[PDB]
Amino acid sequence: EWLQAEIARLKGKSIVPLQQVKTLHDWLDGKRKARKSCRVVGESRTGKTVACDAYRYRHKPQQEAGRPPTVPVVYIRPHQKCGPKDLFKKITEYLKYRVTKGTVSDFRDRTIEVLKGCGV
DNA sequence: TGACTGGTTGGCCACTCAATTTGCATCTATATAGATGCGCATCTATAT
Ligand SMILES: Nc1ncnc2c1ncn2[C@@H]1O[C@H](COP(=O)(O)OP(=O)(O)OP(=O)(O)O)[C@@H](O)[C@H]1O
Numbered sequence A: 001e002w003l004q005a006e007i008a009r010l011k012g013k014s015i016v017p018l019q020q021v022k023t024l025h026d027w028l029d030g031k032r033k034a035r036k037s038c039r040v041v042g043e044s045r046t047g048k049t050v051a052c053d054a055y056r057y058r059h060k061p062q063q064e065a066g067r068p069p070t071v072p073v074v075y076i077r078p079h080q081k082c083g084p085k086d087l088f089k090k091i092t093e094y095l096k097y098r099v100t101k102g103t104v105s106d107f108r109d110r111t112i113e114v115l116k117g118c119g120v
Numbered sequence B: 001t002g003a004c005t006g007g008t009t010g011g012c013c014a015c016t017c018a019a020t021t022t023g024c025a026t027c028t029a030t031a032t033a034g035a036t037g038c039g040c041a042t043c044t045a046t047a048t
Protein backbone atom coordinates (compact mmCIF):
# COMPACT_ATOMS: atom_id res chain seq x y z
CA GLU A 1 0.00 0.00 0.00
CA TRP A 2 0.89 3.73 -0.04
CA LEU A 3 2.40 3.35 3.50
CA GLN A 4 5.28 1.22 2.32
CA ALA A 5 6.84 3.53 -0.12
CA GLU A 6 6.83 6.24 2.49
CA ILE A 7 9.49 4.77 4.59
CA ALA A 8 11.63 4.82 1.53
CA ARG A 9 11.36 8.55 0.77
CA LEU A 10 12.05 9.22 4.41
CA LYS A 11 14.82 6.82 4.69
CA GLY A 12 16.11 7.71 1.31
CA LYS A 13 18.84 10.28 1.10
CA SER A 14 18.74 13.51 -0.87
CA ILE A 15 20.64 16.74 -1.49
CA VAL A 16 19.14 20.13 -0.69
CA PRO A 17 20.85 23.26 -1.97
CA LEU A 18 21.89 25.50 0.90
CA GLN A 19 23.87 28.76 1.16
CA GLN A 20 26.82 26.92 2.76
CA VAL A 21 27.01 24.50 -0.24
CA LYS A 22 26.85 27.23 -2.81
CA THR A 23 29.65 29.11 -1.02
CA LEU A 24 32.02 26.15 -1.37
CA HIS A 25 31.24 25.41 -4.98
CA ASP A 26 32.24 28.90 -6.05
CA TRP A 27 35.34 29.01 -3.85
CA LEU A 28 36.51 25.59 -5.18
CA ASP A 29 36.10 26.89 -8.73
CA GLY A 30 38.44 29.74 -7.94
CA LYS A 31 40.93 27.18 -6.59
CA ARG A 32 40.40 24.86 -9.61
CA LYS A 33 40.93 27.62 -12.24
CA ALA A 34 43.90 29.02 -10.27
CA ARG A 35 45.47 25.51 -9.58
CA LYS A 36 45.93 26.43 -5.89
CA SER A 37 45.87 23.77 -3.18
CA CYS A 38 43.83 24.60 -0.08
CA ARG A 39 42.03 23.01 2.91
CA VAL A 40 38.40 22.96 4.08
CA VAL A 41 37.79 22.85 7.84
CA GLY A 42 34.77 22.59 10.08
CA GLU A 43 32.94 20.47 12.65
CA SER A 44 32.00 16.91 11.74
CA ARG A 45 28.25 17.36 11.35
CA THR A 46 28.29 20.40 9.08
CA GLY A 47 27.87 18.29 5.96
CA LYS A 48 31.26 18.83 4.35
CA THR A 49 31.38 15.37 2.68
CA VAL A 50 27.97 15.93 1.09
CA ALA A 51 28.87 19.36 -0.32
CA CYS A 52 31.90 17.71 -1.98
CA ASP A 53 29.70 14.94 -3.45
CA ALA A 54 27.32 17.58 -4.85
CA TYR A 55 30.37 19.35 -6.39
CA ARG A 56 31.78 16.15 -8.00
CA TYR A 57 28.45 15.48 -9.75
CA ARG A 58 28.46 18.80 -11.62
CA HIS A 59 31.49 17.74 -13.75
CA LYS A 60 30.72 14.35 -15.48
CA PRO A 61 33.56 12.30 -17.18
CA GLN A 62 33.86 12.40 -21.01
CA GLN A 63 34.51 9.00 -22.74
CA GLU A 64 35.25 8.11 -26.40
CA ALA A 65 35.29 4.63 -27.74
CA GLY A 66 39.00 4.07 -27.65
CA ARG A 67 41.24 6.41 -25.68
CA PRO A 68 41.03 6.94 -21.83
CA PRO A 69 38.64 9.52 -20.19
CA THR A 70 38.86 13.19 -19.05
CA VAL A 71 37.88 13.48 -15.32
CA PRO A 72 38.25 17.00 -13.83
CA VAL A 73 37.57 16.30 -10.09
CA VAL A 74 38.73 13.30 -7.96
CA TYR A 75 37.19 12.65 -4.50
CA ILE A 76 38.68 10.14 -2.00
CA ARG A 77 38.08 9.32 1.72
CA PRO A 78 41.26 7.56 3.01
CA HIS A 79 40.94 4.75 5.60
CA GLN A 80 42.43 5.16 9.10
CA LYS A 81 46.28 5.34 9.10
CA CYS A 82 46.24 5.33 5.25
CA GLY A 83 49.82 4.68 3.98
CA PRO A 84 51.38 5.48 0.54
CA LYS A 85 50.29 2.27 -1.29
CA ASP A 86 46.74 2.75 0.08
CA LEU A 87 46.54 6.36 -1.19
CA PHE A 88 47.75 5.41 -4.69
CA LYS A 89 45.33 2.45 -4.74
CA LYS A 90 42.38 4.85 -4.01
CA ILE A 91 43.37 7.45 -6.66
CA THR A 92 43.77 4.55 -9.15
CA GLU A 93 40.41 2.91 -8.23
CA TYR A 94 38.26 6.08 -8.44
CA LEU A 95 39.27 6.13 -12.16
CA LYS A 96 38.71 2.34 -12.65
CA TYR A 97 42.20 1.79 -14.07
CA ARG A 98 42.39 -2.03 -14.48
CA VAL A 99 45.90 -2.70 -13.03
CA THR A 100 45.49 -3.79 -9.36
CA LYS A 101 48.84 -5.26 -8.01
CA GLY A 102 52.23 -3.57 -7.43
CA THR A 103 55.24 -2.51 -5.35
CA VAL A 104 54.79 0.90 -3.55
CA SER A 105 57.30 2.45 -6.01
CA ASP A 106 55.32 0.97 -8.96
CA PHE A 107 51.96 2.38 -7.74
CA ARG A 108 53.66 5.80 -7.21
CA ASP A 109 54.88 5.97 -10.82
CA ARG A 110 51.58 4.49 -12.14
CA THR A 111 49.46 7.05 -10.18
CA ILE A 112 51.42 10.04 -11.54
CA GLU A 113 51.01 8.47 -15.01
CA VAL A 114 47.17 8.07 -14.72
CA LEU A 115 46.71 11.64 -13.37
CA LYS A 116 48.59 12.82 -16.56
CA GLY A 117 46.77 12.39 -19.96
CA CYS A 118 43.56 11.74 -17.91
CA GLY A 119 43.56 15.51 -17.36
CA VAL A 120 42.66 15.67 -13.61
C1' DT B 1 76.95 -100.97 -22.34
C1' DG B 2 77.56 -96.60 -20.00
C1' DA B 3 79.51 -92.19 -21.94
C1' DC B 4 78.29 -88.32 -25.27
C1' DT B 5 74.97 -85.19 -28.13
C1' DG B 6 70.31 -83.75 -29.88
C1' DG B 7 64.66 -82.79 -28.73
C1' DT B 8 60.71 -80.49 -27.37
C1' DT B 9 54.87 -77.51 -25.03
C1' DG B 10 62.11 -20.93 -1.44
C1' DG B 11 65.29 -17.07 -1.69
C1' DC B 12 66.44 -11.72 -1.78
C1' DC B 13 64.61 -7.35 -0.52
C1' DA B 14 60.88 -3.80 0.51
C1' DC B 15 57.01 -2.55 3.30
C1' DT B 16 53.64 -2.97 7.35
C1' DC B 17 51.53 -3.99 12.03
C1' DA B 18 50.95 -5.50 17.05
C1' DA B 19 53.67 -4.71 20.91
C1' DT B 20 56.29 -3.57 24.60
C1' DT B 21 60.23 -0.67 26.52
C1' DT B 22 61.73 3.42 27.97
C1' DG B 23 61.52 7.84 28.94
C1' DC B 24 59.10 12.38 30.22
C1' DA B 25 55.40 15.48 31.73
C1' DT B 26 51.31 16.05 34.86
C1' DC B 27 48.60 15.52 38.49
C1' DT B 28 47.54 14.31 43.52
C1' DA B 29 46.75 13.29 48.15
C1' DT B 30 49.08 13.05 52.13
C1' DA B 31 53.01 14.28 55.79
C1' DT B 32 55.17 17.56 57.99
C1' DA B 33 57.66 21.66 60.14
C1' DG B 34 56.99 27.19 61.43
C1' DA B 35 53.85 32.00 62.21
C1' DT B 36 49.97 33.71 64.67
C1' DG B 37 46.75 34.43 68.16
C1' DC B 38 44.13 33.93 72.68
C1' DG B 39 43.95 32.65 77.88
C1' DC B 40 45.42 32.90 81.89
C1' DA B 41 49.20 33.58 85.86
C1' DT B 42 52.58 36.91 87.65
C1' DC B 43 54.83 41.14 88.71
C1' DT B 44 54.77 46.33 89.20
C1' DA B 45 52.68 50.68 90.02
C1' DT B 46 48.90 53.85 92.09
C1' DA B 47 45.21 55.38 94.82
C1' DT B 48 42.00 55.80 99.28
N1 LIG C 1 23.15 20.15 1.68
C1 LIG C 1 22.53 19.20 2.37
N2 LIG C 1 21.28 18.82 1.99
C2 LIG C 1 20.67 17.86 2.69
N3 LIG C 1 21.09 17.19 3.75
C3 LIG C 1 22.32 17.58 4.10
C4 LIG C 1 23.09 18.55 3.48
N4 LIG C 1 24.31 18.68 4.13
C5 LIG C 1 24.26 17.81 5.11
N5 LIG C 1 23.08 17.11 5.14
C6 LIG C 1 22.68 16.07 6.08
O1 LIG C 1 23.76 15.82 6.94
C7 LIG C 1 23.79 14.42 7.31
C8 LIG C 1 25.15 13.85 7.00
O2 LIG C 1 26.17 14.79 7.39
P1 LIG C 1 27.52 14.86 6.53
O3 LIG C 1 28.06 13.47 6.35
O4 LIG C 1 27.30 15.69 5.31
O5 LIG C 1 28.49 15.66 7.53
P2 LIG C 1 30.05 16.00 7.49
O6 LIG C 1 30.27 17.31 8.17
O7 LIG C 1 30.55 15.80 6.10
O8 LIG C 1 30.64 14.84 8.42
P3 LIG C 1 32.14 14.46 8.88
O9 LIG C 1 32.93 15.75 8.81
O10 LIG C 1 32.02 13.92 10.28
O11 LIG C 1 32.63 13.42 7.90
C9 LIG C 1 22.60 13.77 6.58
O12 LIG C 1 21.47 13.67 7.43
C10 LIG C 1 22.35 14.74 5.42
O13 LIG C 1 21.02 14.70 4.96
Ligand SMILES: [Mg+2]
Pocket (backbone or CB within 6 Å): A048, A049, A050
Ligand atom coordinates in the same frame (compact mmCIF):
# COMPACT_ATOMS: atom_id res chain seq x y z
MG1 LIG D 1 32.82 14.08 5.67
